Amino acid sequence: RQSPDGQSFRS
Amino acid sequence: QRQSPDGQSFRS
Amino acid sequence: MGNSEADRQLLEAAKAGDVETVKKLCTVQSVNCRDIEGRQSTPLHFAAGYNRVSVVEYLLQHGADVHAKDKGGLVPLHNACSYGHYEVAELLVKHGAVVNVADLWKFTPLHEAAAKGKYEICKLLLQHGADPTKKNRDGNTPLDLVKDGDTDIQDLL
Amino acid sequence: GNSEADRQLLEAAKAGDVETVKKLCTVQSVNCRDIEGRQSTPLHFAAGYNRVSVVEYLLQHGADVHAKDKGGLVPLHNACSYGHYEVAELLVKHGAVVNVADLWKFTPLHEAAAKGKYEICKLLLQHGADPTKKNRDGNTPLDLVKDGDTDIQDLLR
């Protein structure tokens, strides 16, 4: 089970 | 009286 | 086989928040296309996980599917929650996102938010009727996934 | 009124138009003020409107986390009033003073508490925000919490 596409911070 | 800062809670 | 150049460009633009390119490439046929190369995210998954509010907005107004699932069973709301994007999550729910949906391992958006330690998201999902007793394939609730030293989400959950 | 360059920079900061910021932002311009509003700087605009890329560029190019608008608000007030966690994180990382007060002696924690922003309050707290400071009216941030944001009240308790 891998991560969803995306990230927590815009920086 | 005290006023709101420039900005907004939601981008949309 | 790969996606057409155009669906590729639409997915890229969504991940980057390039609303002008999304406008250019977004049609009834393309809006819910899938990144078959990657994990089959739709433009909305990308926009949601990368916190591109203006793209999320545009996509939703153009028939993007809040119920579409990627290769692992995740809907865009899972993406928003896993990454702590509160406004995005709110916009999705406002446009019909089911809060209790589970992926292929029965992880719910709330499992995601809990595990990620995303406090406001948990409160948001609960405040919108998310069921804290739901178990994933491992028999774990969202509470079970809350990290130690994250004392405050536990009490919330 | 402001020079055209300054006006364009302020508008671009509000808009999150970073390419336009990069073209207009110099050491002389970076802390210009909106003389036809409430004397917000470009960082006040970027922080209030949650333009992360712009906030980041500005902080790296001489933008003043101590600058106050006509009401004594610093950009961290703007970020906290409108619940922009990452923005508040970036400001604090670049040395924003958490206990700063405006002309009415509201601190960023007064703003976060009144606007019911939990994680922001938690961040400010973790950074030495003083939950006991009173504004000119005699009110602590706890005093301003909406009944019932009981979690916030408990945080500040």
Query: For the domain that residue D62 is a member of, what is the CATH number?
Result: 1.25.40.20
Torsion, CA D90, CA D94, CA D98, CA D100, rounded to 10: -120
Amino acid at D59: L
For C128, residues 6+ apart whose C-beta sits below 8 A from its C-beta are C93, C99
Q: Indicate the helix (H) or strand (E) that contains C27.
A: none
What are the C-alpha distances in Å from D57 to residues A9, B5, D19?
Answer: 15, 21, 10
CB of D65 closer than 8 Å to CB of D59: yes
Rounded to whole angstroms, the Cα distance separating C67 from D57 reads 37
- Host domain of residue D43: 1-157
Judging contacts by C-beta atoms under 8 Å, the chain C residues touching residue B10 are 53, 87, 90
CB–CB of C118/C84 below 8 Å?
yes
Longest alpha-carbon distance in chain A: 26
d(CA B2, CA D60): 31
DSSP C52-119: -HHHHHHHHTTT--TT---TTS--HHHHHHHTT-HHHHHHHHHTT--TT---TT---HHHHHHHHT-H
C51: helix, strand or coil: coil
- 3-state SS, residue D4: helix
**Total tally of structural domains belonging to chain D:** 1
DSSP code for A4 = P
CB of D127 within 8 Å of any CB in chain C?
Answer: no
- Which value, in Å, is the radius of gyration of the alpha carbons in chain D? 16
Q: Are D76 and D100 in contact (CB under 8 A)?
A: yes
Chain D interface, best mutation among B6, B10, B11, B12, by max D CB count within 10 A = B6
Q: Residue C16 class from Cβ within 10 Å (0-12 exposed, 13-18 middle, 19+ buried)?
A: middle
Strand (E) or helix (H) holding D6: helix D4-15
In C112-149, which positions are buried (b, 16+ CB within 10 angstroms) versus exposed (e)? Answer: bbbbbbbbbbbbbbbeeebebebebeeebbbbebbeee
Please answer yes or no on whether D14 and B6 come within 8 Å at the CB atom.
Answer: yes
